[PDB]
Amino acid sequence: MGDKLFQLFQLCLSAISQCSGTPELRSLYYSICYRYLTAVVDRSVTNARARTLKAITLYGDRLLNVICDDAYGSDTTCQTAAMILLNALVHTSRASSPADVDCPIIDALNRLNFIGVLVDSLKEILNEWLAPASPSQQYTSAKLALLLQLCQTRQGAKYVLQANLFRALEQSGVFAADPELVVPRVVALERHYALLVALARVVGAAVTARGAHNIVQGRKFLTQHRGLVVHVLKKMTRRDEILAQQALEERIEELAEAFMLLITATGFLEYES
Numbered sequence: 001m002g003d004k005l006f007q008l009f010q011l012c013l014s015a016i017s018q019c020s021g022t023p024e025l026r027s028l029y030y031s032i033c034y035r036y037l038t039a040v041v042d043r044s045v046t047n048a049r050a051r052t053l054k055a056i057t058l059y060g061d062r063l064l065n066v067i068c069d070d071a072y073g074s075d076t077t078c079q080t081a082a083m084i085l086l087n088a089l090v091h092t093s094r095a096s097s098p099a100d101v102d103c104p105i106i107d108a109l110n111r112l113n114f115i116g117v118l119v120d121s122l123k124e125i126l127n128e129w130l131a132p133a134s135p136s137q138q139y140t141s142a143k144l145a146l147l148l149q150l151c152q153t154r155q156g157a158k159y160v161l162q163a164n165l166f167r168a169l170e171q172s173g174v175f176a177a178d179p180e181l182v183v184p185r186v187v188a189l190e191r192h193y194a195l196l197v198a199l200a201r202v203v204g205a206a207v208t209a210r211g212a213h214n215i216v217q218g219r220k221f222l223t224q225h226r227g228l229v230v231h232v233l234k235k236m237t238r239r240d241e242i243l244a245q246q247a248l249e250e251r252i253e254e255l256a257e258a259f260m261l262l263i264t265a266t267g268f269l270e271y272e273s
Contacts, residue, residue, distance in 0.1 A: 006036075041092070
């Protein structure tokens with residue numbers, strides 16, 4: 001019955017494309033659009049997703065611009081709403097789909113050189129991740145999510161690796177180090193390993209989602225960051241620290257899985273001869 005909210009969704013898209021207003025007003029627009037795109041999913045279910053995707057693509061790049069350059073602007077409260085909206089826009093666009101999805105949103109973001117700046121941001125991800133000026137935690141999270149979603153498709157993974165992913169990851173130094181060699185300690189390790197899981201998933205996703213071309217790239221990622229993969233593969237009082245530990249080893253388990261997926265998906269062992 002969310003058809004009365006549709007015309008609201010339309011008004012929001014209009015204002016945004018126009019870009020008239022304080023970012024405070026566009027934060028409101030982004031929030032409304034986020035809730036509409038997430039309150040729709042949960043020949044009639046596809047027709048609605050069709051009406052929506054149609055509403056978005058109507059304004060074209062003119063719309064994706066305003067939302068993108070807010071995701072990288074001064075106002076922090078705004079860039080969070082913007083990054084979340086984008087993450088939601090590339091989700092309802094895949095939901096409108098057969099694996100040969102040719103997403104017009106992902107294609108648009110690449111055409112706006114937004115995936116480029118997105119990957120480049122990873123160079124300072126570590127400092128950006130451990131610090132609460134500085135962008136929000138919900139923002140950085142929304143960014144890693146967007147990255148992971150782009151890589152779960154063929155064209156998207158291509159765009160991300162074409163924007164030099166492995167390079168920015170090497171420059172971030174997030175992997176070329178050890179985590180335990182560094183607020184409680186267990187919390188610090190849950191946090192760090194959390195970041196490692198995210199990025200490790202983005203790498204595995206980009207490698208599997210292509211073919212044979214990037215097998216070399218992921219292979220080199222493992223070799224160069226070996227020792228960490230092997231260190232990971234090798235394995236207050238009673239209220240928060242018991243859960244803190246429970247969480248830490250769970251994030252370490254997740255990371256171990258990601259590495260194993262990136263190993264079999266190369267495959268590293270065959271290489272190791």
